[PDB]
């Protein structure tokens, strides 16, 4: 029977809580979703509602586009939304393992993006560490992760990066020096970062993990877009094994190709991760969870695994093509072998004329429908939530050159690289011709 | 021309930023949505993406159900999502005015539910008031609003309510006594509440507003489900006129009949409300905004206004039917004329036998597909985030009786009341027969 | 259990094959559709296809919009599409009874519109009556019903209508005179018509039925848009009781408010109706059947019955408003009490100036977004499939005046009448002002 | 601008009426569809309707799933549906050329399946040839094409096929012998067939075309599933060049992977093809046209061309795998090099035991979710619409053996062949073990 085949797949999902090897057909998926939504009281045919939160919906466009999941995630009032939440977190745990953190103990989807999800971690740790006022943070010029600390009501302690060749790396001496200066009890946590813009590289998590274990200080990893990278994930896995990592947080959109809106908070200590979940007040949107559930069931392990493999290949393709273009314009690819996602070519040939050529190149790429490229000048001064950054965008006060960023992130296609290379070549020609 | 008629409506929305008098046809709405999504870079036909957040989508089910809005709300990378956000906040401001707060200066949708949205207000006020550690809070037995204070890292100062007849009301003397005891500078804010479970009533906002203006302390109003009530909204409007209200927060789902997930933060001081918006780190889900935009454009002013009128009528219908049932079972409707949404009938005839009959009645209603009713016993002890509540569910340590809650909230139908009355009558009969 | 409630409704549909009293919720309907489509082999998860008609679908937009019903209607290859067809025909039979033909024996949806469905009836009757070459047809100026006879390969025998007051009615003497002239065996059938443009009225079916019973000649009724009228349906029911009706055919779109595309063929002799079904070669589109199934399950008996009641009320409203306008312009409503759907006001005040004012009025209404009105002049000569019609549009060679048609058909709203009246008034004023 | 890029594609479609080289994104397609539907009067915001066919829709599920195309295909009342029809027929003409008939003059989508579309051709030819009563038809055991002739009211003249090796081929002598016997004027047309079940092969169209040109008799080609085959299409193209072909008809579902429901009628004489279109009475469903428009715009030339290439490859794969299996069971692949889509392996090893093993094998494959296979026994007697077929299913009275059919049709995947081979192998083993 056709129906039994669908039920077999559903039952296997419910009993194991694992991503199916092969992606489900849409037919199976929509059957499952409809049966789940049937379990929510708002969808009961015999229901009457006499409360203030009945999951009533005025617009049929709204109800249908959400598969009639209205109540969000948590006698129960929403048994299907609850099961949706359970399944999705179970699927996500298994993908975390698949992706490289095999010892992960616990995780949960939270329908806030990565910044606010990090804030939630910091808000939870306040009650663990009432004496703490500082968060030690190796510098990365990204506004949201930096603001997350201020939002949580702590003061960031910005640790400048060390220039090693072309790469910007964790200053481990300065981190330990600030712990000793300020006092371990006054530090809320170390806030490290994996995936980042080249020529910065993922933080030295093993070493920071050792430092945190020894000084007895929480370690929170901004893994925003590092789940897609088995190298970034090995760094988390190794760090947890050789020292201390308390939580790692990753974006749903950047690693799973779904709308912006949600993140995953994961860790190795189940009671602690539960404490973060419990620190969240009230119901939350089920929409990020639904998007990731749809995506993971449709892809299967094999589909997600293939996406990860294709990204590695696109990275190789992107670097070989960008290095070739760079060199053809008498530029070079910065040597950043410790960054597995992001790369940078120098813009020395257009910089230095005092005509804003580097910024102009960025705008030119933008108006030619190139998105995601970052033209980083020398000398941006920018103040973010109380803190003034010298050399903003470059993660250092005095990086030796201007450069252009590009990145091979999950779902990148060959036409992404090809069109980029084509339009970048033309833009470089225009600028240089203008400078004569 | 047919197309010009659609464009006229769209252009009028864009130029005035106001809810159309009559609801748009779905045809107009979907035209508009598709044209908006066209403005996001991920949807550009000529686009190439070389960054880490390109709004790529693996699942067609996911992309389509969100109308291809992927990037969430904020060179720009997402011009349509940005315009969506602008329009929606403008529509919401106008509905706030429509609903009873005509002097509202500023507001924004935040894709967190009401609890976390209140937390965000408290997180913002931390930077305004570094010496503050306390939030003064007239008691309401609702976990999320209470937890919001703890999550923000403040300690709640629980002010017990005064029993006046059957109603539980703001103890204004105790509020002022705690301000003086603890010191104005050590108070982060007063956290009041409008719409609530009977026999509690909306807080005395005019008087609290006067107190807050005089002691120079912020006033944050939990208006979770009070937007649907012109009486609750008059209380906010009057309070702002005679004293101080800094922010008022309301649920999207409870006032607009959309999925759980979002809230509105509004106020009378534009710079301050902007500061709360700016305290939020990173991008956020556009899904709550989209749901409310769809809903408000489809309803129009006239449709939303009609929903508000129908709720008032359903309240009258619900109370007349519940009073009639109560009296037929030798119970009574508690006299709560200061609560415009929630009501309560006594359960004295089944309580007092030491057999858990009140709790049992609640479960009986639940298993008979009645949702939203609250059977409140005498004597619940419950600890929430560090604080132990006596008489939990009843908003007081010694409320004189057990009672049952019901409420006429927006979108309630006559069959909601009728089925409820029918099943409640049968349940009361069963319990009483059992007690002989 | 929520799911059991849905299954109860489905099971009741499957066991009785009758329209539910109250409309199904969309949730129940889509559950049912998905479960049905599961029964088609193309949707089997374990299926392999090695034939030429496997129901493969390239476009996900196409597959989804049809609920994955691909195979159309008929070891079996399509068990769900087959069950869909069975259910839909059973629902339609019951609506035919509801609508006024309680003795209907058999019917089937055919995914051709009414013209081709009549052709199919004529094609079937060819094999019953090999000597027949003529179809006797009381005149109605509608191209499709007339062409249906030619398409079938018969020659129409056009019987002119009798003017009785303002109405055009069946010339029963001329019908019988042509039977006798041509010979009963040489007549394939009588092709009568119910719902039609005023001032024509439904054919005299009782009398024609008696004639057909006596001369032993098939009687095929064009009931294109007469199902929505209990008066038109009583005429079919009475005619079948007092004489002979072999088949009656009605449009799906005009009586059920669904896309153009399908029709119903019904009758009182089950073997004969089966013969028409069997005369159709090959598979056919399931789309008309699906549309009517969705519509009838969502409406229920009560919803469809309410639509029929509202149409009667709109007819009264339309005539009272049109009579009032007519008289205000010194025109009159033609006295057509035997037409229950269509009406006509005279255009004598603008006609007669030899300036094409009547045609011009029709175009003016069209450019002012009035659809469905017919401005009928005196003196249209028009040739349709070999036959030249004098006074084309007016169903007679010498109807005494020009007039304007309007009709109250199912789903008409008060704003349809109101806007029509408003724009018609303005148009009449413009024309008369021009004629000075 | 993003919007201009979409409009450029649309404008190019409208000006050239040709399939885009590369498939449109869904975004572009749905934009286009929505803009088209805007042009139909039922969708006009300012519209009032006072007629009997206003395109009103009761169900939002129905309206939305058809993109608000309600009126079907034809002052005008439906300008967008009309343009839809125009575009689709233009796209289809170009695909006919792409597929191998480069000299095609005219074609149109008709929303009837292939059988009824052939009937329409025969119905049209009746008026061209009033003396004709016969249709000469080389035998193919397919019920719908045979019934199409009877439905049209003609008598089929069944020409038995000639056995050449393993193939069944056109008996050209018998065709000419029947023309001479019955008289050219009494023949309505020759009804030939291209794509068919092996071991029958496509009719000898060049030779039949010469015969038809010489005797002055119409030639109607059943090209039901031959459009997907450049060899079948070359036969039509060559036949038209060396002789007479008046119309060729093909299934939409079998060549374009859309629901059953529609067909294309094409030819080389534009006035004649127009005459067939004009012989159709009334409006018709736009749904088949919409499905093929969606499909062709999403695929582009390149996508459809790739599908055709993949089918050729799947044919090679299917035959090599089926030949290998056959031989492993001491059977053989029948030598049918003139059939480019269908193949047959002998079932001699299980046939001959008088135990219905051949029929049983067919049922076994069916219950193991193999669809589209045909187990053809020796000796089926079956009467279809008045005519008794000896050896029904095998296209001859005395085909030497029982065999099994399989076919590589458009959209076939490797798993279709692989699973089929796997399950067929197991079934053969079961049967042979049972026969000991």
From Swiss-Prot, chains A, B, C, D:
Binding sites annotated in the UniProt record for substrate: 75, 283
Modified residues (N6-(pyridoxal phosphate)lysine): 254
Swiss-Prot/TrEMBL GO biological process terms: conversion of seryl-tRNAsec to selenocys-tRNAsec; selenocysteine incorporation
Cross-referenced InterPro entries: PyrdxlP-dep_Trfase, PyrdxlP-dep_Trfase_major, Sec-tRNA_Se_transferase, SepSecS/SepCysS
UniProt: tRNA binding residues: 241, 368, 433
Cofactor(s) for this UniProt protein: pyridoxal 5'-phosphate
EC number: 2.9.1.2
Localization of this protein: Cytoplasm
EC category name: transferase
GO terms for cellular component: cytoplasm; nucleus
UniProt-annotated binding residues for pyridoxal 5'-phosphate: 53
Pathway(s) where this gene product acts: Aminoacyl-tRNA biosynthesis; selenocysteinyl-tRNA(Sec) biosynthesis; selenocysteinyl-tRNA(Sec) from L-seryl-tRNA(Sec) (archaeal/eukaryal route): step 2/2
A molecular function GO annotation: O-phosphoseryl-tRNA(Sec) selenium transferase activity
Reactions listed under catalytic activity: O-phospho-L-seryl-tRNA(Sec) + selenophosphate + H2O = L-selenocysteinyl-tRNA(Sec) + 2 phosphate
Keywords annotated in UniProt: Cytoplasm, Phosphoprotein, Protein biosynthesis, Pyridoxal phosphate, RNA-binding, Selenium, Transferase, tRNA-binding
Residues marked May act as a substrate filter by repelling compounds with a negatively charged alpha-carboxylate (site): 52
Subunit comment: Homotetramer formed by a catalytic dimer and a non-catalytic dimer serving as a binding platform that orients tRNASec for catalysis. Each tetramer binds the CCA ends of two tRNAs which point to the active sites of the catalytic dimer.
Family to which this protein belongs: Belongs to the SepSecS family.
Physiological role: Converts O-phosphoseryl-tRNA(Sec) to selenocysteinyl-tRNA(Sec) required for selenoprotein biosynthesis.
UniProt-recorded name of the protein: O-phosphoseryl-tRNA(Sec) selenium transferase
Protein species of origin: Mus musculus
